[PDB]
Write a protein that binds this ligand. Structure first.
Ligand SMILES: N[C@@H](Cc1c[nH]c[nH+]1)C(=O)O
Ligand SMILES: N[C@@H](Cc1c[nH]c[nH+]1)C(=O)O
Ligand SMILES: N[C@@H](Cc1c[nH]c[nH+]1)C(=O)O
Ligand SMILES: N[C@@H](Cc1c[nH]c[nH+]1)C(=O)O
Ligand code: NA
Ligand code: NA
Ligand code: NA
Ligand code: NA
Ligand SMILES: [Zn+2]
Ligand SMILES: [Zn+2]
Ligand SMILES: [Zn+2]
Ligand SMILES: [Zn+2]
Ligand SMILES: [Zn+2]
Ligand SMILES: [Zn+2]
Ligand SMILES: [Zn+2]
Ligand SMILES: [Zn+2]
Lengths: 401, 401, 401, 401
């Protein structure tokens, strides 16, 4: 309540500290939105975000590590400069910023960078505005490039960037406010067929591509209704007067779990290899470098986030049904809420790029950032919540194993 | 020429002996045409043909063996009753008589029985009307049922009925007069798919049938243009509300040689097994009991037959592109000429049944029978022709091996 | 409460009246379960159910109409014999009883007949055990044959059997207790292709069936994930040596609404007609006599039923995702709850036939019948519930239009 | 015979005049073979061939028209400079020279240019070496670019280049010597599908391409065995995460006649439009600018050419089963013999490029050129042959109409 230094007063300070930084946070959003960059090519966004945390007053109070493990990734850390002779809490906030080809930031990833920077700013301000000994906490900001292709979070996982985080937060703009939305696991694959080019002495690799297409097509009747299979024939011949000795298909499969994705992938391999057997061609089946994991929910973290958004005016009920945050949620307890930004346009469409950079979207972005910061304060000052977050994380991890 | 007992005079007697038997040979044709019977069910035709050779005067001069190896097959033999203390010539004439379902004798097999009986009658009469010692010859008539399905000639081959024949003759009515027409090799197959019948827990055997159909369909572009593949989906499900756990296809393949038929059959097996792999079903691939061989030609026998038909007024240029006579031609030198019967209708059509039983067809049938009988006389009295027939048979046999 | 003639006391009497009839209701179940009969062939079940209501004491107090509109359908009615010089309430209870081929009553329809007869018995006993003037109510039992094929309820709808009913009740055994489960709309179709049977002069009707199969197969990627399409190739040729001039497919489509089912059906027609265009065959597309409607829920009726089952010990969370009760729910407000019967077996499986006729299933059947009877008493004595049932019915009807 | 100025002596002079020019004709072949150029890009070959006829002694005795109608086409004409106050004979010889991409002159078109230039040289020398009045003849050489793609002869036909020719000659190197080989008619087509890119709101243009492929594939069973259909999927999608709204196929069809090609093309259009109907996409079907005609034979011209090659030592028994000479043969009586060049390699293969430029091929090229020149002399001095050539041309033209 009104009591001296209550948790309610700290959550207020975090909201006021975000409102005070509304101007430069909006400039951060515009800087990324105006210069859209693709996966692993976000050099300007990396410059903009690293400079942002460097200039945060007092300068160098955020320990910033540019080019952290990836050329466009970065890492910024803050803790209250104090000690007393007992493990500190590590709270992580992620910033995405890569855009889509041709249409710009049609996923509103400029707002994801803004909302992750704002939440970390609000947490520090709430702890800064605390007298007495502040509890041991380290605020960690991680710039994770290449969400839309590659999986920069996975590259960071392989570098050990998430091994010492206790909780991780981010948020993603969408069409409705939901503390959790089902993002599925994904496996990418490239299929190449090789034949030999008098057509009686011919192995038709284009036949193999079409037969593979037919094999998967009739299989759709027996897929679990939650499964997804989409693919194209990238290469289906060059000239009609020569038997195509080469064909190439590119597919990706999605299932709500790693176990179900393995069954779907084996079923697809059977379809690809059957096309080789029927056509006489040889086949190479090459999976992508990284499989995307489904996002594990965290019940305790979820319920605490919803209670904070309710006080803020958020009414609760994604874009791509898979994200590399799923790999993160498998190693660190996290939440990935989606938030409405004042538009009816769909993600990955041109009209969403308009909404992502609009002035109307800034209110919804900064409001959701406030909810993330207050939820982070909840974990800091409620040990029973932190244990409940860990129990929910351990239980969910056993089922998915 | 006019000389006492010339080969020209013997060929005339064979023609006169056939003309004299025109009445009862036509009755033989009508008896089979009027009561059409299917493969291995030709009990009446067997009765009619056995009685025919039994009543040939003097009675029992034809040694007739009814129910020879097959219930509806038979065997009739004649030789001049004389000896002198040096291997005799065995000349075979085949009679087919099985009809087609529904449309009757749309292949004119009633005329095949007539033409084989007439040729053997003409040969005996030409030798009967010879004074002095007649050369050692045995005229053998073989009733071969089930040409249109099963291959009764093959059943007779397995009984050793052709192991002591030197030359074999028959003729088949068609649309044009040709001393030889390309009949191909054939392999029949029945394909059965087995799945398991909540459709996510389903193996769709109907998918396997359709995928097998697609696999063979695109393969048609790479088949040799002389190859043929035809098939049906005999069983493709029973009720739509149950995943079909069983499917059944029936196919036959044709190629001009045994070697090429093996390549086509292996290619088809790959298509059938690929459908099993793509659908998850198991597959049984069951070939027919008998493969049909292509008909080997005999150049010497061919040229001698054409020279005899030319003197008779026949002008030279089939129904099913495969016949069990091909298996016979592989073990005995033979000819299988086709002859026009005064009709434009196609074989295996209702309007050919009309032509096969017409009065107009009797002249063309008895004329071709005359050509067969004279050709048989050529082999009897020209040792240089018999050796040339055997050399052509040995050479053709090596290529097809 | 304990008050003289409370609604709570009437619900108790209905439960006691059902418990008293447990013996003969179980005999009713066994009589139908032991002699399984198919759609429109349920002559014995019709005899058993009509005799049941005739012998209910005092005899002829149930006005029974055998062979009502359908040969195996029936109608039984009861009202308190009294008047006073104001429209009476008509409450309907449905009895299903047709079984499945081969596996018997694998849907537990013997229990559906029992539960509908028991609920109507319990309502009459609760009203019988009421002194003073009883409110004007007519209990109507309708025997609806051919649920699993045909749609006997639709035949009864066309006879006007539901035009004077205010509320209608039934229940269906399943795996879990749910006051409502999504049953979809369904449209059946039979597709026939006609060609012309020298294969160059051939229209292949089997090609049309396979091409239609392929057209629908690739369409599955673009169907709404709630849609369902299942079909078979009933006729795909007779002999491989003749081009198939005829083919036949049987399909059914399911969508959660009539509007969505029309879009799916037009899309399928495009696939069927495209196969005709590609093959050159003509096509006949014949829809089933009756389309099945999706089941409209009724919120007020639903919530009242759940509150009654809770007092009975039922814990709340189908077989065929479509039923002719959906057509009934479109013209009369109704509920179609599913109830667990002590088994893990799935509907339409052999092991569910075991559960449907077991002694263990009688407790769950009679318990759910008690819940139906108490819910019927709620409608009789709560005018605010009846109006709320009608408002929910009118609102739901506008959306589905 | 030996008589003063016999036709036999003129044919000898034509052979001696070709033998004398063997050196510079071989240089002509090497100049084109060493610098392979593609359709309509044969600038160097045009320079080489125009300069060849310009430098033929006496210079400018060949009236050469460079850049004739096409940039790389040309025209050279010679006649004996004399008059007398009765229509002259126009004899045409064609030179091809365009090569194949990547593999060079794998069709030996360098030899086609050489053989057409040599035959025209031999004819002029035979007429030059004639005293007295020479009959009125004009030797016309036409450079026809872009045989392997485009049809430069057709461009020349549209300019009227063949309207005043009486007979036309060329020759094409192959594997065996044949005065005529069946080259078929050809029709090219490009098929484009347009859809609309939430996959439930999607028209899949890749489905249209695959369905079109399946439609044509099953059609192969019913094509006439002389027909040919080959095609590729040039564009079958770009990224798997977007429904392909565009697809592109490229096909060509071949039939032995224009009438049969029209039936095959309509059947293919039905397959392409059916894919549009099944997928919901719109389709554009665009045929090539020029259809290729089948080559009409000329019996009289054929028999005269074979009699000349026999005297030369040629023993008689193509690459692409269609050529733009077929369009020429439809408007001018012509022959297009194929000739062996000392190699077993196949046309359009790398090893044929080796043979085309070898020293071994020069003897066979110059020998066939001698046969063309003598055949041209036959037409000049046998009026009964010229009339027979025209009667055969008129009769063959009526059947193909
Ligand atoms: N198929 C998507 C999946 C995805 C990952 N991140 C965003 N989208 C891709 O191309 O990467
Ligand atoms: N496929 C044909 C082949 C044949 C053999 N004999 C006559 N026809 C069959 O059913 O037997
Ligand atoms: N497809 C099912 C649908 C159904 C209606 N009732 C029960 N099941 C049928 O054959 O009728
Ligand atoms: N399909 C061949 C046909 C052809 C014409 N000339 C030579 N080849 C082409 O691409 O042109
Ligand atoms: Na600011
Ligand atoms: Na007689
Ligand atoms: Na009782
Ligand atoms: Na020279
Ligand atoms: Zn995105
Ligand atoms: Zn995104
Ligand atoms: Zn036949
Ligand atoms: Zn036959
Ligand atoms: Zn059922
Ligand atoms: Zn049921
Ligand atoms: Zn070429
Ligand atoms: Zn060429």
């Amino acid at each position: 309540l009104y009591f001296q230094g209550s948790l309610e007063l700290l959550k207020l300070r975090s909201a006021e500290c975000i409102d005070e930084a509304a101007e430069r946070l909006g400039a951060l959003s515009r800087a990324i939105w105006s210069q859209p960059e693709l996966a692993y090519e976000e050099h300007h966004a990396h410059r903009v975000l690293t400079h942002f945390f460097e200039r945060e007053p007092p300068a160098a109070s955020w320990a910033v590590q540019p080019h952290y493990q990836l050329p466009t990734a970065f890492r910024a850390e803050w803790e209250p400069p104090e000690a007393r002779a007992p493990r500190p809490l590590h709270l992580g906030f992620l910033c995405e910023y890569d855009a889509l080809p041709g249409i710009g930031h049609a996923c509103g990833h400029n707002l994801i960078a803004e909302v992750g920077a704002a939440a970390a700013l609000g947490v520090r301000g709430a702890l800064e505005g605390l007298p007495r000994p502040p509890p041991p906490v380290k605020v960690v900001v991680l710039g994770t490039p290449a969400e839309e292709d590659g999986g920069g979070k996975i590259d960071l996982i392989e570098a050990g960037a998430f091994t010492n985080l206790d909780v991780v937060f981010m948020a993603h703009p969408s069409q409705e406010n939901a503390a959790y939305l089902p993002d599925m696991a994904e496996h990418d694959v490239t299929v190449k067929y090789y034949g030999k080019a008098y057509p009686w002495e011919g192995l038709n690799a284009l036949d193999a591509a079409v037969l593979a297409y037919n094999n998967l097509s009739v299989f759709r009747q027996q897929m679990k209704p939650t499964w997804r299979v989409h693919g194209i024939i990238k290469n289906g011949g060059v000239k009609p007067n020569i038997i195509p000795s080469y064909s190439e298909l590119i597919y990706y499969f999605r299932a709500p779990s790693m176990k179900e994705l393995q069954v779907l992938t084996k079923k697809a391999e059977d379809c690809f290899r059957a096309a080789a057997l029927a056509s006489g061609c040889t086949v190479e089946i090459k999976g992508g470098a990284h499989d995307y994991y489904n996002v594990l929910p965290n019940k305790s973290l979820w319920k605490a986030y919803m209670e904070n958004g309710r006080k803020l005016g958020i009414e609760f009920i994604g874009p791509s049904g898979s994200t590399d945050f799923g790999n993160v949620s498998f190693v660190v307890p996290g939440i990935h809420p989606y938030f409405h930004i004042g538009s009816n346009a769909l993600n990955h469409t041109e009209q969403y790029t308009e909404a992502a950079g609009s002035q109307e979207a800034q209110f919804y972005t900064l409001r959701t950032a406030k909810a993330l910061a207050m939820t982070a304060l909840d974990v800091i000052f409620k040990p029973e919540l932190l244990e409940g977050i860990r129990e929910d994380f351990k239980l969910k991890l056993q089922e998915e194993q």
